[PDB]
Amino acid sequence: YYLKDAGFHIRNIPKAWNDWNLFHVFQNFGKVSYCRVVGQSNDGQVQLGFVNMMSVADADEVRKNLNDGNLIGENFTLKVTDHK
Amino acid sequence: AYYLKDAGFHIRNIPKAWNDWNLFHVFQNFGKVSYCRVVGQSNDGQVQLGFVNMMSVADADEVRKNLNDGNLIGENFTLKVTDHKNVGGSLLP
Amino acid sequence: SMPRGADQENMLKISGYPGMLNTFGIAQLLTPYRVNGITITGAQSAVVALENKFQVYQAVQDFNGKKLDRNHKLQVSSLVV
């Protein structure tokens, strides 16, 4: 189905992004297996997504760059939580 | 039969008591081995003839590095090593 | 061979590898990306279906222009231009 410990739920995605924007963020941490923006809030202001890295080692690289489950980028903050 | 270009060797002067695993062990020290066979013997039986294909040209180059005048020298053997060449036009693209 | 109905965004062209490779060997060239189907198109070329367009994108970046050895250079491109 999936690879244990390689996947993330993504919240607080900016409204303008598409799946390639989400991909570009996570490609800097390792290889990406799967990346989807799945929908958006009722107000249309934030989006929810899912990213699977290619390997647990790639996902651990993501984890090393979080702070309290937040991925703080140049102009955004993503809430990143493990998929189980 | 076609083998990875520049990855293979013809081997002469193999000691009479060796089998293909002895030959494999000698070449494994230089890298991964794709194929290994003792194909015949001399007339006096004192030595045997063989063929070794390394898994990659890089492995075969590491063999070519440890040679001395076309010979692989061991603590009690000396192998005559020459490059294998495929037959032209046999590959069908 | 190839799954009936595959989407072109999942496909890439790969060429230049050694002419004796079989389909499993072509898949090995593309480690670690998920390969779902391979159609050989010549001794040294094939069309490959990967899991999705992100894996195609990364495989092109990883493998196009790759020197396999002094006799073989890979050409990798997405089928969607």
Place this chain on the structure above:
Amino acid sequence: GADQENMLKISGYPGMLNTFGIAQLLTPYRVNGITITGAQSAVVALENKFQVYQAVQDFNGKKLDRNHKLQVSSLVV
């Protein structure tokens, strides 16, 4: 011609793998056929017994990640 001395058993990899993914585990050894025998197990025909020997040494007991370690053994003892 098939030959059991060309063959190995491999298990313990992620259950999501297909046969191409199992072959990817065995890079760079030449894989000529794969039979799935379970959700995390297969039998693989490599080119010859020397590749079997080297694959067993390279991959038996190999940690793939904290959740998976490979089991690799020649079919003939």
